[PDB]
Amino acid sequence: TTIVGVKFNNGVVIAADTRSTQGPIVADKNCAKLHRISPKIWCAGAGTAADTEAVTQLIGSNIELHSLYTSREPRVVSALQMLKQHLFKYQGHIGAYLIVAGVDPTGSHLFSIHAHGSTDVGYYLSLGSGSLAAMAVLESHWKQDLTKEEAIKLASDAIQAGIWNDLGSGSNVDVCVMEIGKDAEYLRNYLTPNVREEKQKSYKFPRGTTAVLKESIVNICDIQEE
Amino acid sequence: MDIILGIRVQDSVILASSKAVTRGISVLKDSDDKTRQLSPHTLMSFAGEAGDTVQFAEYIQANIQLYSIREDYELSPQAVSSFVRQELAKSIRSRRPYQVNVLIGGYDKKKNKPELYQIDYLGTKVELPYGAHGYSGFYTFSLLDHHYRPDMTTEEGLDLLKLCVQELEKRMPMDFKGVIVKIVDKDGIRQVDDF
């Protein structure tokens, strides 16, 4: 997994690759690793996939109830605090490694979160097996006062470095841009540089190729009248 | 314990269970009955870790007998087997699981059909024409695969069972001291006293 976060002039952008793996096998080629905690707080997750998903839904659910209770839009620091205390309590067994970004009435924010519950602040961050390839790109091209267009470019280039150089990463680049005073724009499959070429042959079989023993209609309908 | 076999024929279920009880280096008993009557038309044989086997069997027996009295009705073999499976499936994630494998032979009086269920200590249930637990199947299934027919009489089932026991007595290293054979049919449960 390669996931990054990059701050810019008036907000923050996060990105991620779309490959999920079970050992050396690719389980899903177009996996969605950008999760929504709230409308303008999004996070990307590496590690155990069920954990990143579950911990995001839980905190996202509680963040929503908190927002309704307080009559205020949710804050990134609240998501961060709730995530870290939950993960700390489970002493690293909940294998969620997250980059949490978002905009709120306080401003724009970017944090990372490791599975044992430790958090970090930064202008640019990367997590996952392809984080070293991505961080190499970020350390080479990052500067202060990036524009929106420059940050999207830098973030996707950092994911590409992971896609091409890390075997744990691949397929497509997903992006989410969170700008101050605007709706967060989720760009699913922002880049698609790994479409499979046409196969040499069609493997459609002639009808009646498979040997059958029995046929029967399955009753999916309920018990009928009359 | 060791060998437990089951075969479902036309009109009955036949269970065969070894008589030996071995603690280590000695054979303490050669007439042990590894079975419990759960209801008038349902029999359960069992094998596994010592103590747990009888404790589990008698616990199941008590529960089915309780149901029978409460409802004045005998549960179907299928219903009993499902109850037993759930208890074992519950047990496998306990502090100390029941290390017990069972065969349930019953005659369903409603459907007028014999029924044989094989359940292991994990709670893995399968309905079968013939079944076994442990290494018993390894020696007997090839014979059963060849000779078995769904319309066999009880006498033909016993003859096929004798062939299975003879193969076991030839190729198994352990002396299991013969088997006690019991038949479950429409008239209930009875023991074949000469085998």
Binding site: - | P129, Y139, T140, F141, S142, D145, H146, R149, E167, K170
Partner: protein
């Protein structure tokens, strides 16, 4: 693996399966589990593929040298003992072998020796070896007689491997049959289990448990 061999009125029947596995992965269904040591001697293959192939091929070289030196066919006793003594030298090192050495000489008649990588060497009338050995034993023990015709003996060996192929997960593929007489062995074909099962089931009335 399921391999068997048995003595009878017409000589020796040798029958083996064809499956090779790496864990649950089926590596091959076309393995030659019988080795032609010469026109008179056969060896069966169980355990490690390589160990069995290498050292039974080697055994054929030693047998050839014996009969070059002694101007006479090597006995099944002598041939089996060369192999057992060899693997005994390697005992502990981790060889993995369970083999039947089968032959037919004037002085001995039809003879089978079970040879083993722990150094065991046993003469006998019936042997089954491999993961599916118990399944094959059942069919053999209940149907074996001395007064079997070459035709019936061949079928029993075929049927016993099929029994094991059905039940044992690490046995299957196809059946290779050999018949060993005093003038040499005779190959009796490769029989796909996928076709043999449905054929035997239909003709024999067996496997009523399986739907077809």
């Amino acid at each position: 693996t399921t391999t068997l061999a048995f003595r009878f009125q017409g000589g020796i029947i040798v029958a083996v399966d064809s499956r090779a596995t790496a864990g649950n992965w089926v590596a091959s269904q076309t393995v030659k589990k019988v080795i032609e040591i010469n026109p008179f001697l056969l060896g069966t293959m169980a355990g490690g593929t390589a160990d069995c192939q290498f050292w039974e091929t080697w055994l054929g070289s030693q047998c050839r040298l014996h009969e070059l030196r002694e101007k006479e066919r090597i006995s099944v006793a002598a041939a089996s003992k060369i192999l057992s003594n060899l693997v005994y030298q390697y005992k502990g090192a981790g060889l993995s072998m369970g083999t039947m050495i089968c032959g037919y000489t004037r002085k001995e008649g039809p003879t089978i020796y079970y040879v083993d990588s722990d150094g065991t060497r046993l003469k006998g009338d019936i042997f089954c070896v491999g993961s599916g050995q118990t399944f094959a034993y059942g069919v053999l023990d209940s149907n074996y007689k001395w007064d079997l015709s070459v035709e019936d003996a061949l079928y029993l060996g075929k049927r016993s491997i099929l029994a094991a192929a059905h039940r044992d997960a690490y046995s299957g593929g196809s059946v290779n049959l050999y018949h060993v007489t005093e003038d040499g062995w005779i190959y009796h074909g490769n029989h796909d289990v996928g076709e043999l099962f449905w054929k035997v089931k239909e003709e024999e009335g067996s496997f009523n448990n399986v739907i077809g």
